[PDB]
Design a protein around this ligand. Structure first.
Ligand SMILES: O=c1cc[nH]c(=O)[nH]1
Ligand code: SF4
Length: 212
């Protein structure tokens, strides 16, 4: 009803990641396909047991067609290295698959703008498809958007950071760990950003030890 179908019309009944990624290029589940160059689907293979979910592609992601290749990806890799996790053993994706940005004169263009909850819920069927395909043991939710995508619109990362949680409406019942988004660490107060980074590394280590 006045709740949207969003991407559900566009998701094929398949577990194959190539078929899903190509189908996502055709998605018109929300408005974000219009400004964006292409859909940015996940990176990695179905053999991964840990899935990590960011917010949305940024500028270089939208051009490259792959997640976490810009500055946020550098910070993500710093954290993964500190947590002794191999990025190529992960399945990395985003809550929203099309880059949302403004082109408005005169400000910085091609910088991320906040996805609407409408858009996140519209795009969530792709996440469900990816979780059905990869069958992760653990899903790390990087930041508020991704966390709310699976844990609900009233979810606060600051109240549950690093806890190992479960929800009732996701296929296969992976453990969920909500944590800091690496992009949040690019700028901000020094002490809090470094405490947040250490907490991210802790949460990543926790996620790597969990088998529900
Ligand atoms: O892939 C990406 C890049 C930047 N920020 C995100 O949330 N995901
Ligand atoms: S952001 Fe997601 S729901 Fe919206 S058009 Fe792109 S793939 Fe479809």
């Amino acid at each position: 009803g006045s709740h949207m179908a969003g991407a559900q019309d566009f998701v094929p009944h398949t577990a194959d990641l190539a078929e899903l990624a190509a189908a996502a290029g055709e998605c018109r589940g929300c408005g974000l396909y219009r400004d964006a160059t292409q859909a940015v689907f996940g990176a990695g293979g179905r053999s991964a047991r840990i899935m990590m979910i960011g917010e949305q592609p940024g500028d270089k992601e939208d051009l490259a067609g792959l997640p976490f290749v810009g500055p946020a990806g550098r910070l993500l890799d710093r954290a993964l290295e500190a947590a002794d996790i191999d990025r190529d053993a992960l399945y990395v994706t985003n809550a929203v698959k099309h880059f949302k940005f403004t082109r408005a004169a005169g400000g910085k263009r091609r910088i991320q703008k906040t996805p609407s909850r409408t858009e996140v819920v519209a795009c969530r069927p792709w996440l469900i498809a990816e979780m059905t395909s990869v069958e992760p043991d653990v899903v790390v939710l990087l930041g508020a958007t991704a966390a709310k995508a699976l844990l609900g619109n009233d979810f606060r990362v600051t109240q549950h950071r690093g806890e190992v949680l479960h929800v009732d409406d996701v296929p296969g019942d992976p453990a969920l760990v909500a944590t800091v988004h690496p992009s949040s660490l690019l700028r901000g107060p020094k002490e809090e950003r470094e405490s947040a980074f250490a907490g991210l590394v802790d949460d990543l280590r926790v996620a790597a030890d969990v088998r529900p």
